[PDB]
Design a protein around this ligand. Structure first.
Ligand code: CA
Ligand code: CA
Ligand code: CA
Ligand code: CA
Ligand code: ZN
Length: 316
């Protein structure tokens, strides 16, 4: 809507206070006009109809429990937009400042969040397995990254191409978590997963096997469940990414870490310049090697580490 840009204050899912960009026009709306064509957050009111109603508040103060998921979805979408703009010089997910829209309070006790090709959607969780999913910055960045992939490589959500699609979202979800410096780690969804159990997460990039996911190509899932194991086989790529950044010895193969910044540059270039809708793991390796070559030279340590990382997880 048309109005005056202002700043409100509220508390997120984890109880932390933060300032959020809003728009004033009779009511204060969760509409951030400071980033691209705007960031809009909607209330799905426990229904499944999308997007719902643009979030309206009477006093620009968001401290009600019902407000929490909206505050975080709105705020973290902004942080993610900043990451892509400041680090990769990319304006929003389409590269042309497309408006970012998110709906919270989707359905009842919904233990999931997703990008539906047009917007982000967040469930509130059942309170046991998950608390409102927008409370996790790696979750929000994971979803917005799916939008980036859709407008670039367009990786099909099935089999190996889908596993890469998933890994890319976990990789950048984690890089954004580090960017915001919010208790960063290489785990996925730890802030909103199982509130009654500390120390766990949905997936782990440092050790995918901790939760039963494969950490080597020889252990890849070949069934039909989960669209061919897109959330399972992503562990093979996540481990490779972790090794490239942090280094280590995996299955007898030693990798010299080159850091998170370079990991981000290498994968962003691979995603935007070399990957295609049907790319498989072997092609991702080639794309990553070529990207590192473009940026640091064929005889660089960076290229060496990328090769070692993929060798470590058995991807030739
Ligand atoms: Ca209020
Ligand atoms: Ca964390
Ligand atoms: Ca995390
Ligand atoms: Ca937990
Ligand atoms: Zn995903």
């Amino acid at each position: 809507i048309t109005g005056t840009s202002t700043v409100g204050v509220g508390r997120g899912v984890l109880g932390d206070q933060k300032n959020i960009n809003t728009t004033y026009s009779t009511y204060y709306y969760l509409q951030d006009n400071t980033r691209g064509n705007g960031i809009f957050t909607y209330d799905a009111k426990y229904r499944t109809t999308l997007p719902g109603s643009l979030w309206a508040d009477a006093d620009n103060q968001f401290f009600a429990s019902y407000d929490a998921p909206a505050v975080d979805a709105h705020y973290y979408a902004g942080v993610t937009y900043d990451y892509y703009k400041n680090v990769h010089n990319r304006l929003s997910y389409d590269g042309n400042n497309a408006a970012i829209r998110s709906s919270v309070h989707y359905s009842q006790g919904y233990n999931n969040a997703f990008w539906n090709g047009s917007q982000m959607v967040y469930g509130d969780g059942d309170g046991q397995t998950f608390i409102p999913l927008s409370g996790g910055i790696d979750v929000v960045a994971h979803e917005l990254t799916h939008a980036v992939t859709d407008y670039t490589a367009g990786l099909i959500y099935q089999n190996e191409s889908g596993a890469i699609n998933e890994a890319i979202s976990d990789i950048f979800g984690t890089l954004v978590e580090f960017y915001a410096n919010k208790n960063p780690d290489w785990e996925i969804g730890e802030d909103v997963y199982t509130p009654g159990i500390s120390g766990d997460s949905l997936r782990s990039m440092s050790d995918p096997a901790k939760y039963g996911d494969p950490d080597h190509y020889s252990k890849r899932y070949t069934g039909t469940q989960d669209n061919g194991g897109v959330h399972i086989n992503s562990g093979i790529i996540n481990k490779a990414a972790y090794l490239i950044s942090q280094g280590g010895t995996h299955y007898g193969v030693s990798v010299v870490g080159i850091g998170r910044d370079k990991l981000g540059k290498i994968f962003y270039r691979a995603l935007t310049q070399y990957l295609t809708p049907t790319s498989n793991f072997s092609q991702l390796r080639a794309a990553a090697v070529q990207s590192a070559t473009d940026l640091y030279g064929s005889t660089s340590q960076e290229v060496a580490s990328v090769k070692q990382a993929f060798d470590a997880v058995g991807v030739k």
